[PDB]
Amino acid sequence: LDVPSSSRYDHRIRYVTYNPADVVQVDTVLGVATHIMLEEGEQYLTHAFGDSEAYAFARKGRHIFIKPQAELANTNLIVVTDRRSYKFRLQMRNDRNGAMYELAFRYPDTQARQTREANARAAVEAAFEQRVGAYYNLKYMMSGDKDIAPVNAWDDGRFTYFKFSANADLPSIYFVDAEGNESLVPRTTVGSSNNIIAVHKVNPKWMIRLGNRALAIFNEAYDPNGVPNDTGTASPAVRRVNKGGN
Amino acid sequence: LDVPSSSRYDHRIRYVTYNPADVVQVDTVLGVATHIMLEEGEQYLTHAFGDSEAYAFARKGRHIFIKPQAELANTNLIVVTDRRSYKFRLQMRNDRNGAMYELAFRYP
């Protein structure tokens, strides 16, 4: 016996929380259809009355509608899902007053799960945009075809940034290894006007090419060690956690 | 029990704001059809009268018409769609006056 709680606007709509160890009491009258509200994504397996002909049962996905059909319909309705078993005590009210148009179920655990993820999302976004605790290397040299040069190059120990002017074509940037071989390196384009090419590596030497013009960028303060990436993201204030479990 | 509020040019057209925690009282007279007007982009799933025989039901897309088909037709109409679920307390008025030609919804 978990009596549902009527809504402040109207007494017809009632809310009670699911509990596996209790049955919910319903006060149904003649000629009204009660809307039993299920959780999103459940699986109706079966159901069972103690008196089938007393009530009329219509279901569509997660929407159960029940109305009385016979006199003195005092029985129960048990609905089993994939995740739990719903228990009702269908007591037929006799005056045709105070019906239950809907019975919405509140689930504590799903409330807690759904509310925490939004807080996590907001905190994670704020922590990416926080962007503190970074040292900036500005000891960068260049030599070559200056007409494809950036106006600024620097790195924060994790990525290297090349800032280009508004009127400059964005060139292609290549990773130069110890023997002088060039290879591809991933890049993302950042900045308010897409004027910064951030490459995902710190290297002693870079090569910039556009067409038939080449420019060499030199990191004159190359730190071989750098800051280790213990968090799995680009910032130390956000952590990448294994959701998949498995 | 949100009674809908009429327009200022005629009372035959009522309006109501949607509320998932309150029913809309519907006043039906004999021999009229009620155009219940749903929100755009809304897909009908299922409806369940209090009495299928006490009212006539017609639906084309998101338009709904209900019309009393029997005496003492005091029931409830619960139509459930993708976005929300509507509740109507259909109550037949015997005097054949003050009908509701259209019910139009508002959403906060």
């Binding site: 009329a56 219509a58 509608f65 016979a70 | 009495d51 299928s52 025989e53 006539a56 029997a70 005496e71």
Partner: peptide, 19 residues
Amino acid sequence: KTPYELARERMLRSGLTAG
């Protein structure tokens, strides 16, 4: 059969959806 009695019989007989 008074109208209220016939109304009650109608209410008991009715299905959830006509059709």
